[PDB]
Amino acid sequence: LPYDASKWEFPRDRLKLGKPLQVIEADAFGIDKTATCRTVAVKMLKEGATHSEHRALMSELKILIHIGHHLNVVNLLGACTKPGGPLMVITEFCKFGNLSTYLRSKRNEFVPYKVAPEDLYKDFLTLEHLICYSFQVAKGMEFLASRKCIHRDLAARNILLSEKNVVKICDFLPLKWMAPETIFDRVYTIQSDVWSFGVLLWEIFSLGASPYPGVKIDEEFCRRLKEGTRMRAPDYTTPEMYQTMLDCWHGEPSQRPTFSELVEHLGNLLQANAQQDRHHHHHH
Ligand SMILES: Cc1ccn(-c2cccc(C(F)(F)F)c2)c(=O)c1-c1ccc2nc(N)ncc2c1
């Protein structure tokens, strides 16, 4: 893959590094044509990285360039790659952090839908929010899958909350997100990402709970998963959303929905939910 320096290269002295999130928060001067000073996130190699470790982050940068822009994938802004300092990959900064942590903090601030007076539920999460986060991640994953990309670590911890309830796919016990074929055969495909998406759905509709609550992650866990045991419906799910999780958790990878099918399905459930809400709002 190519690296186009004229488009992407950013001077190192235009950054002020801040607190670690290695991924670090930073201030960037003149990275945009939209503003002078902007907060950003920087991924860089620690002191004493090898030639091969340098190649890994470089290949990741090129892949982000090749992938291109989507609202639901953390947006690359620039890079420091030329000699004189460490390799640095610069993206937008999502100040609200990961989705798991956020959902966990909203557990006392949930109603399934809003009615009048709406101020009683100011900044509350609703079913529209949860389905909307799901829909957004599905679209970002359909964008990635279309470009022959496999995420490999799709989990709520790798979903970022931005302004105006926009979520973004990023890449910061992992076994609880892995498909059976990934565990037992070390096979990574787009279909195994769909499995992980299902576990991500469970996380959203449990408001940031840890998958397989109270289950020891040993050889018995893997045995039962391969043999068809699944998580039970989480506390904030709808019946259709739980069925969607089960679909993502199909034993045969080819029998799981595609991200394209998930985008259409979740979009329809978002619309049905909104139509329901408008009726709740009207009659009360
Ligand atoms: C800084 C950076 C650089 C690269 N990537 C990255 C690497 C590989 C893949 C991807 C993906 F999945 F978005 F395509 C993204 C990143 O996800 C990030 C990244 C990581 C954590 C972040 N956390 C916050 N709060 N904001 C932005 C972040 C960016």
Shape: globular
Q: How is the quaternary structure best described?
A: monomer
Strand content: 5-15%
CATH architecture descriptor of the largest domain: Orthogonal Bundle
Rounded Rg: 20 Å
Structure ligands: ligand C52
| Largest beta sheet: strand ordering | 1-2-3-5-4
- How is the CATH topology of the largest domain named? Transferase(Phosphotransferase), domain 1
* Beta strands, count: 7
Tally the helices.
9
- Distance N terminus to C terminus? 57 Å
Fraction of residues in H or I helices: 25-40%
The figure for the number of domains is 2
Descriptive notes:
- It is a single chain.
- By secondary structure, this protein is an alpha+beta fold.
- The protein has two domains: 1-93, 2-Layer Sandwich (Phosphorylase Kinase, domain 1); 94-272, Transferase(Phosphotransferase) domain 1 (Transferase(Phosphotransferase), domain 1, Orthogonal Bundle), CATH 1.10.510.10.
- It is built from nine helices and seven strands.
- The protein has helices at residues 5-8, 51-67, 99-104, 127-146, 180-185, 190-204, 219-226, 239-248, 259-283, and strands at 15-20, 23-29, 37-44, 76-80, 88-92, 159-161, 167-169.
- It has a five-stranded antiparallel beta sheet with strand order 1-2-3-5-4. The protein has a two-stranded antiparallel ribbon with strand order 6-7.
- A hairpin with a 2-residue loop joins strand 1 and strand 2 (23-29).
- Helix 4 (127-146) packs antiparallel against helix 6 (190-204), helix 4 (127-146) packs antiparallel against helix 9 (259-283) and helix 6 packs antiparallel against helix 8.
- The chain starts with a helix and ends with a helix.
- Residues 21, 23, 41-43, 60, 64, 73-74, 89, 91, 93-94, 97, 151, 160, 169-172 line the site of the ligand Cc1ccn(-c2cccc(C(F)(F)F)c2)c(=O)c1-c1ccc2nc(N)ncc2c1.
